[PDB]
Curated annotation (Swiss-Prot), chain C:
Domain note: The calcium release channel activity resides in the C-terminal region while the remaining part of the protein resides in the cytoplasm.
Record's protein name: Ryanodine receptor 2
Known function: Cytosolic calcium-activated calcium channel that mediates the release of Ca(2+) from the sarcoplasmic reticulum into the cytosol and thereby plays a key role in triggering cardiac muscle contraction. Aberrant channel activation can lead to cardiac arrhythmia. In cardiac myocytes, calcium release is triggered by increased Ca(2+) cytosolic levels due to activation of the L-type calcium channel CACNA1C. The calcium channel activity is modulated by formation of heterotetramers with RYR3. Required for cellular calcium ion homeostasis. Required for embryonic heart development.
UniProt family annotation: Belongs to the ryanodine receptor (TC 1.A.3.1) family. RYR2 subfamily.
Induction note: By TGFB1.
Length: 48, 48, 394
């Protein structure tokens, strides 16, 4: 199952999210830091 | 096993070590004691 | 009928590129000497710019099943879908492989595709898969089929990278349909007979002279002139000419009388051309076009003018014989015949004249593979070192 899931995930690279899209996306650390900034910004976090 | 080596190499290509080290190095928000003495506890469901 | 891909067959891997709402056909090419990375060579614009199929041709050396390949790694076959194949680069003798290195062309997952000198390991083996449902695993691979190539080492597709400004080839996870256009079949090839892509010498006189360019000047403006010369030129690299057909598929087949072609001076890399003044000049690949650079071999100088014949999708019949056959060179567009000026290191100038002289027959002498490779290496080294010298001068 691990091998099959890895193959399917690498065949569909968009499953990894905007950071790990692999084309123009920033790193995982950058994604975590942007998520931090989003969480501590009320406007970008809540429905508003 | 060639399959295991290949899968590990694929995962290493996906995730750089520096990203993991940096995300681990990210600091936490800390529960503080207000001047009144009550615990000012951050909502963990809305943060790191 | 349908004919199938086999081992020891010369092929080119073509891909279709749609940029600015228009189609290009690009062959996977590599200059194995001094460079390992693969690139793309345009063949859709063959009329205005000749393609360099010499570095594009590949040879299907081995075709084993996945289990057989795994057993080998732990320790004329027809290609079948799902087989892992070994592609040997015809010019360099190296092998298409996943380089395990990335230029990081804004694509982290993609690996680079290049040539490797060792067959050992799983980097040089590529599994072939059907493009559509019309083929299935285990079905024999046909010539007209499109293919999907998967790296055994990296489980990545042979991918055409649109995103970066220049067209690239890289081992990625997006799929690209690769057509496998046949170039040559070694077994069906006849010995001592002229085939497309050969490196040869054009012997003019009593087995004496060669069609060549000046040497000592070291100036390309002086080198562009074409003449007849005898002596050590017959063993030097200047007398080496590539014979390139005006077709991609089956370019490596036998050459027939009246078949149009282009002659390329191997050392300089420039194509022979009749200028509007009717003189013979070597000009650049970009400037070389069909109308001026097309030439034909004829059995007799009489103006028979056979005309266009159906194009054969195979080796065809072997008509022109090395050394034995006497050939007359005719420009296709103008009909003129290539003739020595006969003015007073013989150094008789080569011109085009509309009936020539009585002795214009040309014998053909094939060159050895080592000599041809050495000549092309000389050309590449000259180009790179001239760039280096110009940079240092700047």
């Amino acid at each position: 199952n691990a091998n099959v899931v890895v193959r399917l995930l690498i065949r569909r690279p968009e499953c990894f999210g905007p950071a790990l899209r692999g084309e123009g996306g920033n790193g995982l650390l950058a994604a975590m830091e942007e998520a931090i900034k989003i969480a501590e910004d009320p406007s970008r976090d809540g429905p508003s | 096993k060639g399959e295991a080596i290949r899968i590990r190499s694929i995962l290493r290509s996906l995730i750089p070590l520096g990203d993991l080290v940096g995300v681990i190095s990210i600091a936490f928000q800390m529960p503080t004691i207000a001047k009144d003495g009550n615990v000012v506890e951050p909502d963990m469901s809305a943060g790191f | 009928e349908i004919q199938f891909l086999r081992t020891d067959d010369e092929v080119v891997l073509q891909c279709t590129a749609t940029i600015h709402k228009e189609q290009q056909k690009l062959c996977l090419a590599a200059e194995g000497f001094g460079n390992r990375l693969c690139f793309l060579e345009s063949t859709s614009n063959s009329k205005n710019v000749p393609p360099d199929l010499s570095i594009c041709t590949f040879v299907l050396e081995q075709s084993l099943s996945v289990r057989a390949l795994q057993e080998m790694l732990a320790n004329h076959r027809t290609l079948l879908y799902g087989h892992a194949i070994l592609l040997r680069h015809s010019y360099s003798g190296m092998y298409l492989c996943c380089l395990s290195t990335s230029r990081s062309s804004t694509d982290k997952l993609a690996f680079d595709v290049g040539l490797q000198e060792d067959t050992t390991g799983e980097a040089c083996w590529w599994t072939i898969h059907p493009a559509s449902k019309q083929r299935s695993e285990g079905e024999k691979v046909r010539v007209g089929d499109d293919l999907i190539l998967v790296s055994v080492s990296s489980e990545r597709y042979l991918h055409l990278s649109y995103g970066n400004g220049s067209l690239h080839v890289d081992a990625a996870f997006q799929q690209t349909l690769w057509s496998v256009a046949p170039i040559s079949s070694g077994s069906e090839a006849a010995q001592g007979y002229l085939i497309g892509g050969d490196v040869l010498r054009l012997l003019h006189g009593h087995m004496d002279e060669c069609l060549t360019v000046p040497s000592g000047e070291h100036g390309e403006e002086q080198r562009r002139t074409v003449h007849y010369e005898g002596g050590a030129v017959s063993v030097h690299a200047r007398s080496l000419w590539r014979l390139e057909t005006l077709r991609v598929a089956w370019s490596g087949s036998h050459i027939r009388w009246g078949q149009p072609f282009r002659l390329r001076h191997v050392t300089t890399g420039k194509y022979l051309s009749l200028m509007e003044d009717k003189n013979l000049l070597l000009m650049d690949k970009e400037k070389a076009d069909v109308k001026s650079t097309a030439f034909t071999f004829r059995s007799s100088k009489e103006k028979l003018d056979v005309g266009v014949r159906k194009e054969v999708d195979g080796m065809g019949t072997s008509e022109i014989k090395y050394g034995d056959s006497v050939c007359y060179i005719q420009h296709v567009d103008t009909g003129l015949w290539l003739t020595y000026q006969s003015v007073d290191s013989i150094q008789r100038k080569a011109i085009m004249h509309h009936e020539g002289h009585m002795d214009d027959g040309i014998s053909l002498s094939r060159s050895q593979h080592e000599e041809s490779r050495t000549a092309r290496v000389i050309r590449s080294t000259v180009f790179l070192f001239n760039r280096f010298i110009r940079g240092l001068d700047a």
